[PDB]
C-alpha cells in the first residue's frame, strides 16, 4: 500500500515509451499533497507550443484528497489554453519561478477565466513549474488553503518535496 | 536483525565526541525512522513535572533526513509546553500508551495549538512513549505518511523495533 | 518489500529539480545503502568506450550518509581512467560479474593507483556491474565495512536489492 | 556477526554499572581500527588522577586486527604511567586536540620512555582524546602506517569515525 507508488512507476517506467498515463501517478501523488497541505483543490497544467508559440493548458483539475481519475482527468475535448502572459499559472512557466500567492487579485498576473466559466473561487494559491532542462513540461499548483488565510512557509516546503517527485514523475 | 544493526552502528559513528551526544543520537536515529517509515517528520517531546505536576514540552522538531540538529533543537526559552490534559502527545504522556492515528481531525485530544504556531499541518501520526518505570521521559512521534493515507501496521512494527534504542539512549 | 519502498520514496522527495538528477538519486541510493551496510564508503565508476576500447573511471567517490554530492561528484578534467584489465572495478566491467572481495590483498586484479593518491586503505569490497544488454554503464562498490571483518552473504542480498534500482535509474 | 558489536553493547549497557569491561568492546573496536588504517599496532591509555595529580597510564597495547584480548590488556600489575607534559600521549591529554604525527622525534613532546623499554620503535602516530564534557577519560593511538610513510588525510576521517563510538562506549 505504501508500495504502491513505485510499483505503478517501476511499471510505468520499464514500459519504455510513456504511452500509458504518467497522469495516474501524477493524479495518486497529487491526492496525498491534497490531504498534507489541507489545500481545497490541486491541479496540474500541461505546457506545450501549438505550432511554435508557447501555452499552458489544463490537464487535471480540481484533485482532492478523493477525487476519482476520470473526474479530474481534462481529455482535449474541453481544456482551457492561456498564453504565458495571461494568468499566474502562465507567468509561472514562463519566469520558471516558484511562487505563494497568499491573496489573488492583489497579483497582476492572476486571470480569473476559469473562476468565472466554471464557478470556483480562487483566492489563495502555491504555483511550481516541472522543468525538464531547458523547458517547462507543467505548472503545478495548490489552491485555497483551508482552515486559513494562507498557504504558510511550512507549506511550501511540503509542496516543493512532493514536487521533487513528480517533477521525476514527468520524464 | 542486519540492517538494524548496521544502521544503528553507522549512525553511532556520526556523533562528536560534544555534547548533549544523547539527544544528538535521538535526533539521528529519528531521522532514520523518517527515511524508514517515509514520515515527513519525527520530533520528540520532553516529559517532566514540577511540584507533582506533569508537563510536555517541544525538544525536537521537524526531524528529517537532511535536517540539521541545531535546526531542530527547541531553545529552551522557546519552549511549548503543554498540561496533560491537552494535545495527543500530552495523552501519550498520560496514558503511557502508543497510538497510530490515522487522522487528528478525529481524535478528540489533537491540540492544533502548535500547527497555528508554526503553521504547519498536521494529518497522521504515530506517537509512543519513553518510560523509567512509572515515569515518563519523553513522547515521540512521526508525522505525515508520505506514501499513503496512514501509517501502516507494519510501519507500527518498525517504529517500535527503533524506539526500543531511543528508550535505551534516553537513560 | 515496505522499507526499500518507504526509503527509495522519500530519497526521490529529496531530489531538485535541476541536474544531472539522475547521478544525485544514484548519490542519495548509495548514501542509503551505506547505512544499511555499514559500509565506510561507497563509489561508482562509469564504463565507457573509445572506439570498441572500453575504459572504467571515477565519477562518485567517498560517498557516505553526511557526504555532499558535489563533493563526491568527480571532476571530468580530473578523472582516473582505468582500461579494463587493471583493477577489480576494470574486471568486474570486463566479467560482467558481481563479486564480494574480503580482503584486496590477497586479489590480484586489485590496483593499488587510487589508494596511492587519494591517501585511503581499502581492505574489502562488493562490486557490482550496471549493464545494458551487452554493453556494460558503470560498477557500484561499497568499500571498508566498518562492524566485521567483511562484507556478509545476507550483505550480499542488500546490495543487490537497491542495485536493480540503480540499474533501472541508469538508463 | 556484524552484530556482534551491538549485542556485546547492549549486553553491557543495561547491566547499569560499567564493572564488566567495556575495554573488550574498545579492544573488538580497536581491531577493525587496525584494519581499514593498516596501523601496525593500535593502543589506549587511561586518564587519571592519582591522587590529586592528572596522568596518561597504559591499560590497551599493541592491538592488531587479530591479537587477542589477554594479550593486550596490561593489569595493574605492570603499567606505564606518563605526567601531562612527559610524552606526546599526555600533550593530547592536556591539549584535549588530535593530532596526526607524521614522524616523531621531530615532536617535541614524543616520549620515547616505551620504545626503549619494549623495544617497539615508534615513527607516525594519530592521537585522540576521548573527553567526557570536563575531563579527558582516555587516550587513544594509531602507530606506525604500513605500506606508507604516514597517515594520510583519508586516514584521520576514518580514525575519527571509530572514536565517535569508542568515545560514546567509555560512558
Ligand atoms: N476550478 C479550478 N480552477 C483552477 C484549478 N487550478 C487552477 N485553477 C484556476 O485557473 C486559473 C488559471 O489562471 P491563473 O490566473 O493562474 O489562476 C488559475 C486558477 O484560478 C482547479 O483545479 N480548479
Ligand atoms: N510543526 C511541527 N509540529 C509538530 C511536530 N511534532 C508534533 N507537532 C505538533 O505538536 C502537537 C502537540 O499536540 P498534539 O495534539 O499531540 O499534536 C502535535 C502536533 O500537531 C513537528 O515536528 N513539527
Ligand atoms: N578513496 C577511494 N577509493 C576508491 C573508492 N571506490 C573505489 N576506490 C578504489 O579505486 C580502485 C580501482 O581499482 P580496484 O582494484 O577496483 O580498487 C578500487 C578502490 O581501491 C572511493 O570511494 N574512495
Ligand atoms: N609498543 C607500543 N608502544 C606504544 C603503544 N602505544 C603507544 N606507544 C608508545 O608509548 C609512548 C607514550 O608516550 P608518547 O611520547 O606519546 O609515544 C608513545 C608511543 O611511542 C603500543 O601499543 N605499543
Redesign the interface.
Known amino acids: ?6 510499483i505503478l512507476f ?1 511499471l510505468l ?2 514500459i519504455q515509451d510513456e504511452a500509458g498515463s504518467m497522469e495516474k501517478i501524477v493524479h495518486k501523488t497529487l491526492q ?1 499533497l491534497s ?4 489545500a481545497d483543490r490541486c491541479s496540474m497544467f500541461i505546457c506545450r507550443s501549438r505550432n511554435g508559440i508557447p501555452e499552458v493548458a489544463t490537464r487535471l483539475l480540481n484533485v482532492t ?1 478523493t477525487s476519482k481519475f476520470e473526474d479530474n482527468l481534462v481529455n482535449p475535448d474541453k481544456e482551457t489554453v492561456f498564453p504565458l502572459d495571461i494568468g499566474i499559472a502562465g507567468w509561472v512557466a514562463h519566469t520558471k519561478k516558484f511562487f505563494n500567492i497568499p491573496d489573488v487579485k492583489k497579483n497582476n498576473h492572476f486571470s480569473d477565466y476559469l473562476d468565472k466559466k466554471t464557478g470556483y473561487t480562487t483566492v489563495n494559491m502555491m504555483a511550481i513549474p ?2 525538464q532542462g531547458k523547458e517547462v513540461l507543467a505548472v503545478v499548483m495548490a489552491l485555497n488553503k483551508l482552515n486559513a488565510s494562507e498557504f ?4 511550501e516546503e ?1 509542496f516543493k ?5 513528480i ?2 514523475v514527468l520524464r
Not at 504558510?152 to 507549506?155: A, G, L, P
Not at 518535496?161 to 517527485?165: A, G
Open positions: 500500500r505504501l508500495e504502491e507508488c513505485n517501476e517506467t520499464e496525498r490531504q498534507l497541505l489541507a484528497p516541472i522543468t504558510s512557509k511550512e507549506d511540503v518535496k512532493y514536487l521533487n517527485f517533477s521525476l
